[PDB]
Short mmCIF file of all heavy atoms in Angstrom, two decimals:
data_model
loop_
_atom_site.label_atom_id
_atom_site.label_comp_id
_atom_site.label_asym_id
_atom_site.label_seq_id
_atom_site.Cartn_x
_atom_site.Cartn_y
_atom_site.Cartn_z
N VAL U 1 11.31 -16.53 -15.05
CA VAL U 1 11.75 -15.47 -14.15
C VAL U 1 12.69 -14.50 -14.86
O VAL U 1 13.76 -14.89 -15.32
CB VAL U 1 12.46 -16.05 -12.91
CG1 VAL U 1 12.89 -14.94 -11.96
CG2 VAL U 1 11.55 -17.04 -12.20
N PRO U 2 12.31 -13.22 -14.94
CA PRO U 2 13.13 -12.23 -15.64
C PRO U 2 14.54 -12.10 -15.06
O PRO U 2 14.72 -12.12 -13.85
CB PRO U 2 12.36 -10.93 -15.46
CG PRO U 2 10.94 -11.36 -15.21
CD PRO U 2 11.05 -12.65 -14.43
N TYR U 3 15.53 -11.98 -15.93
CA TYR U 3 16.89 -11.76 -15.47
C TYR U 3 17.02 -10.28 -15.12
O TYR U 3 16.43 -9.44 -15.79
CB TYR U 3 17.91 -12.17 -16.55
CG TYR U 3 19.34 -12.11 -16.09
CD1 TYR U 3 19.95 -13.23 -15.52
CD2 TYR U 3 20.09 -10.93 -16.21
CE1 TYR U 3 21.26 -13.18 -15.08
CE2 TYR U 3 21.41 -10.88 -15.77
CZ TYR U 3 21.99 -12.01 -15.22
OH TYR U 3 23.29 -11.98 -14.79
N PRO U 4 17.78 -9.95 -14.05
CA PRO U 4 18.49 -10.83 -13.12
C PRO U 4 17.57 -11.51 -12.10
O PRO U 4 16.63 -10.90 -11.57
CB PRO U 4 19.47 -9.89 -12.42
CG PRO U 4 18.77 -8.56 -12.44
CD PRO U 4 18.01 -8.52 -13.75
N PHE U 5 17.87 -12.78 -11.83
CA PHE U 5 17.05 -13.67 -11.00
C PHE U 5 16.67 -13.08 -9.63
O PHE U 5 15.51 -13.18 -9.23
CB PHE U 5 17.80 -14.99 -10.79
CG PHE U 5 16.98 -16.05 -10.11
CD1 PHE U 5 16.01 -16.74 -10.82
CD2 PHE U 5 17.20 -16.37 -8.78
CE1 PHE U 5 15.25 -17.73 -10.22
CE2 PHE U 5 16.45 -17.38 -8.16
CZ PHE U 5 15.48 -18.07 -8.90
N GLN U 6 17.64 -12.49 -8.93
CA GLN U 6 17.41 -12.07 -7.55
C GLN U 6 16.40 -10.92 -7.45
O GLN U 6 15.77 -10.74 -6.41
CB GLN U 6 18.73 -11.68 -6.86
CG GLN U 6 19.34 -10.34 -7.29
CD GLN U 6 20.21 -10.46 -8.54
OE1 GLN U 6 20.20 -11.48 -9.24
NE2 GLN U 6 20.97 -9.40 -8.83
N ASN U 7 16.26 -10.15 -8.52
CA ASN U 7 15.33 -9.01 -8.48
C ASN U 7 13.93 -9.44 -8.82
O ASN U 7 13.04 -8.61 -8.96
CB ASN U 7 15.77 -7.90 -9.43
CG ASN U 7 17.02 -7.18 -8.96
OD1 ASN U 7 17.47 -7.36 -7.83
ND2 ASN U 7 17.59 -6.36 -9.84
N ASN U 8 13.73 -10.75 -8.97
CA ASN U 8 12.46 -11.22 -9.47
C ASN U 8 11.90 -12.43 -8.76
O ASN U 8 10.97 -13.07 -9.25
CB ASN U 8 12.59 -11.53 -10.97
CG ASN U 8 12.62 -10.27 -11.81
OD1 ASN U 8 11.58 -9.70 -12.11
ND2 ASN U 8 13.81 -9.82 -12.16
N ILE U 9 12.45 -12.74 -7.59
CA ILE U 9 12.00 -13.92 -6.85
C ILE U 9 10.58 -13.76 -6.24
O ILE U 9 10.06 -14.70 -5.65
CB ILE U 9 12.99 -14.27 -5.72
CG1 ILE U 9 13.16 -13.09 -4.77
CG2 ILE U 9 14.36 -14.67 -6.31
CD1 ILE U 9 13.84 -13.48 -3.45
N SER U 10 9.96 -12.59 -6.39
CA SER U 10 8.53 -12.46 -6.06
C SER U 10 7.63 -13.45 -6.81
O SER U 10 6.49 -13.69 -6.41
CB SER U 10 8.02 -11.06 -6.35
OG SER U 10 8.18 -10.79 -7.73
N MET U 11 8.13 -13.99 -7.92
CA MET U 11 7.37 -15.00 -8.67
C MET U 11 7.37 -16.39 -8.02
O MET U 11 6.64 -17.27 -8.44
CB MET U 11 7.91 -15.11 -10.08
CG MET U 11 7.81 -13.83 -10.85
SD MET U 11 8.37 -14.13 -12.53
CE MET U 11 6.94 -14.93 -13.26
N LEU U 12 8.19 -16.59 -7.00
CA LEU U 12 8.32 -17.90 -6.36
C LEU U 12 7.38 -17.98 -5.16
O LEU U 12 6.89 -16.95 -4.70
CB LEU U 12 9.78 -18.13 -5.91
CG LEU U 12 10.83 -18.21 -7.02
CD1 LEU U 12 12.21 -18.49 -6.45
CD2 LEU U 12 10.46 -19.26 -8.06
N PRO U 13 7.10 -19.19 -4.67
CA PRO U 13 6.24 -19.29 -3.49
C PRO U 13 6.78 -18.48 -2.31
O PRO U 13 7.99 -18.43 -2.09
CB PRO U 13 6.24 -20.79 -3.17
CG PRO U 13 6.61 -21.46 -4.45
CD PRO U 13 7.47 -20.51 -5.22
N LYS U 14 5.87 -17.87 -1.55
CA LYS U 14 6.23 -17.01 -0.43
C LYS U 14 7.22 -17.65 0.55
O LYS U 14 8.16 -17.00 0.99
CB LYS U 14 4.97 -16.57 0.31
CG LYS U 14 4.19 -15.46 -0.41
CD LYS U 14 2.82 -15.21 0.22
N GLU U 15 7.03 -18.93 0.87
CA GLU U 15 7.89 -19.64 1.83
C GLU U 15 9.30 -19.68 1.29
O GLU U 15 10.28 -19.67 2.05
CB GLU U 15 7.39 -21.06 2.12
N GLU U 16 9.41 -19.70 -0.03
CA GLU U 16 10.71 -19.75 -0.66
C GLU U 16 11.34 -18.36 -0.65
O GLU U 16 12.55 -18.21 -0.43
CB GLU U 16 10.60 -20.28 -2.08
CG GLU U 16 11.90 -20.84 -2.58
CD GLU U 16 11.73 -21.76 -3.76
OE1 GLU U 16 10.64 -21.75 -4.38
OE2 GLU U 16 12.69 -22.50 -4.07
N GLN U 17 10.51 -17.34 -0.87
CA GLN U 17 10.98 -15.97 -0.76
C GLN U 17 11.62 -15.68 0.62
O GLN U 17 12.66 -15.04 0.71
CB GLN U 17 9.84 -15.00 -1.03
CG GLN U 17 9.29 -15.07 -2.45
CD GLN U 17 8.17 -14.10 -2.67
OE1 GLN U 17 8.18 -13.00 -2.14
NE2 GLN U 17 7.17 -14.51 -3.45
N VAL U 18 11.00 -16.19 1.68
CA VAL U 18 11.52 -15.99 3.03
C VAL U 18 12.90 -16.62 3.17
O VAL U 18 13.81 -16.01 3.75
CB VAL U 18 10.56 -16.59 4.08
CG1 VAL U 18 11.20 -16.61 5.47
CG2 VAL U 18 9.26 -15.80 4.09
N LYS U 19 13.08 -17.82 2.62
CA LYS U 19 14.38 -18.47 2.68
C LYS U 19 15.44 -17.70 1.89
O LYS U 19 16.58 -17.56 2.34
CB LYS U 19 14.28 -19.90 2.17
CG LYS U 19 13.80 -20.88 3.23
CD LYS U 19 13.61 -22.27 2.64
CE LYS U 19 12.85 -23.17 3.60
NZ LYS U 19 11.95 -24.12 2.87
N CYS U 20 15.07 -17.19 0.72
CA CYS U 20 16.00 -16.44 -0.10
C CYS U 20 16.46 -15.17 0.61
O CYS U 20 17.65 -14.90 0.73
CB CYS U 20 15.37 -16.10 -1.45
SG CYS U 20 15.16 -17.57 -2.51
N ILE U 21 15.49 -14.40 1.11
CA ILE U 21 15.76 -13.14 1.79
C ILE U 21 16.57 -13.35 3.08
O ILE U 21 17.51 -12.59 3.36
CB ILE U 21 14.45 -12.39 2.11
CG1 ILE U 21 13.77 -11.95 0.80
CG2 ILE U 21 14.70 -11.14 2.96
CD1 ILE U 21 14.66 -11.08 -0.03
N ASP U 22 16.23 -14.39 3.85
CA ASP U 22 17.00 -14.72 5.05
C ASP U 22 18.46 -14.98 4.68
O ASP U 22 19.39 -14.47 5.33
CB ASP U 22 16.40 -15.93 5.78
CG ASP U 22 15.14 -15.57 6.56
OD1 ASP U 22 14.82 -14.37 6.68
OD2 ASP U 22 14.48 -16.51 7.07
N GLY U 23 18.67 -15.74 3.62
CA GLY U 23 20.01 -16.03 3.15
C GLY U 23 20.77 -14.79 2.70
O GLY U 23 21.98 -14.66 2.93
N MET U 24 20.07 -13.87 2.05
CA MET U 24 20.74 -12.67 1.55
C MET U 24 20.99 -11.68 2.69
O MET U 24 21.99 -10.95 2.68
CB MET U 24 19.94 -12.02 0.43
CG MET U 24 20.67 -10.85 -0.16
SD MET U 24 19.94 -10.18 -1.66
CE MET U 24 20.75 -11.19 -2.91
N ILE U 25 20.12 -11.68 3.69
CA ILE U 25 20.38 -10.93 4.92
C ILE U 25 21.70 -11.40 5.56
O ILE U 25 22.57 -10.58 5.88
CB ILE U 25 19.21 -11.06 5.92
CG1 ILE U 25 18.05 -10.19 5.47
CG2 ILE U 25 19.66 -10.67 7.33
CD1 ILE U 25 16.76 -10.43 6.22
N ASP U 26 21.86 -12.71 5.72
CA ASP U 26 23.10 -13.27 6.25
C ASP U 26 24.30 -12.73 5.46
O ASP U 26 25.30 -12.31 6.05
CB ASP U 26 23.10 -14.80 6.21
CG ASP U 26 22.19 -15.43 7.25
OD1 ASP U 26 21.96 -14.80 8.31
OD2 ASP U 26 21.72 -16.56 7.02
N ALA U 27 24.17 -12.71 4.14
CA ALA U 27 25.28 -12.27 3.28
C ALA U 27 25.54 -10.78 3.41
O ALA U 27 26.67 -10.34 3.27
CB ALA U 27 24.99 -12.62 1.83
N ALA U 28 24.49 -9.99 3.67
CA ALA U 28 24.66 -8.54 3.75
C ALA U 28 25.44 -8.18 5.02
O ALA U 28 26.27 -7.27 5.02
CB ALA U 28 23.31 -7.84 3.75
N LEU U 29 25.13 -8.91 6.08
CA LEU U 29 25.75 -8.68 7.37
C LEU U 29 27.20 -9.14 7.34
O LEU U 29 28.08 -8.49 7.90
CB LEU U 29 24.97 -9.40 8.48
CG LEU U 29 23.56 -8.85 8.78
CD1 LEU U 29 22.79 -9.73 9.76
CD2 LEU U 29 23.67 -7.43 9.33
N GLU U 30 27.47 -10.26 6.68
CA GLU U 30 28.85 -10.73 6.56
C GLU U 30 29.66 -9.77 5.69
O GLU U 30 30.82 -9.51 5.98
CB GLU U 30 28.91 -12.14 5.98
CG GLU U 30 28.35 -13.21 6.91
CD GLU U 30 27.98 -14.48 6.17
OE1 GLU U 30 28.06 -14.49 4.92
OE2 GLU U 30 27.61 -15.47 6.84
N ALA U 31 29.03 -9.22 4.65
CA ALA U 31 29.75 -8.36 3.72
C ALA U 31 30.15 -7.08 4.40
O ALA U 31 31.18 -6.49 4.07
CB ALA U 31 28.92 -8.06 2.48
N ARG U 32 29.33 -6.65 5.37
CA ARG U 32 29.58 -5.41 6.10
C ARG U 32 30.90 -5.46 6.90
O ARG U 32 31.52 -4.42 7.14
CB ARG U 32 28.38 -5.11 7.04
CG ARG U 32 28.56 -3.85 7.93
CD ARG U 32 28.73 -2.60 7.04
NE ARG U 32 29.00 -1.36 7.79
CZ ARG U 32 30.23 -0.99 8.17
NH1 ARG U 32 31.27 -1.77 7.88
NH2 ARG U 32 30.41 0.15 8.83
N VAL U 33 31.32 -6.66 7.30
CA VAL U 33 32.59 -6.83 8.03
C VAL U 33 33.64 -7.63 7.24
O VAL U 33 34.65 -8.04 7.80
CB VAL U 33 32.37 -7.55 9.40
CG1 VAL U 33 31.55 -6.67 10.34
CG2 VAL U 33 31.68 -8.90 9.20
#
């Protein structure tokens, strides 16, 4: 997986991509406040 890791998780199984994105969504919303 090319560095940086987060910009390249399309190489992982789709079900895993959903978990990663869900987690980063949580972080984006927390960061906003």
Side-chain angles (χ1 to χ4, degrees), residues 1-13 16-33:
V1 181
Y3 186 91
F5 188 76
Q6 73 275 12
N7 289 349
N8 285 278
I9 58 165
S10 61
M11 299 184 79
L12 296 182
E16 202 161 15
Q17 296 180 37
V18 170
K19 277 175 192 145
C20 290
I21 294 302
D22 283 352
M24 184 170 271
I25 284 169
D26 286 333
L29 292 173
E30 292 160 354
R32 177 61 185 85
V33 294

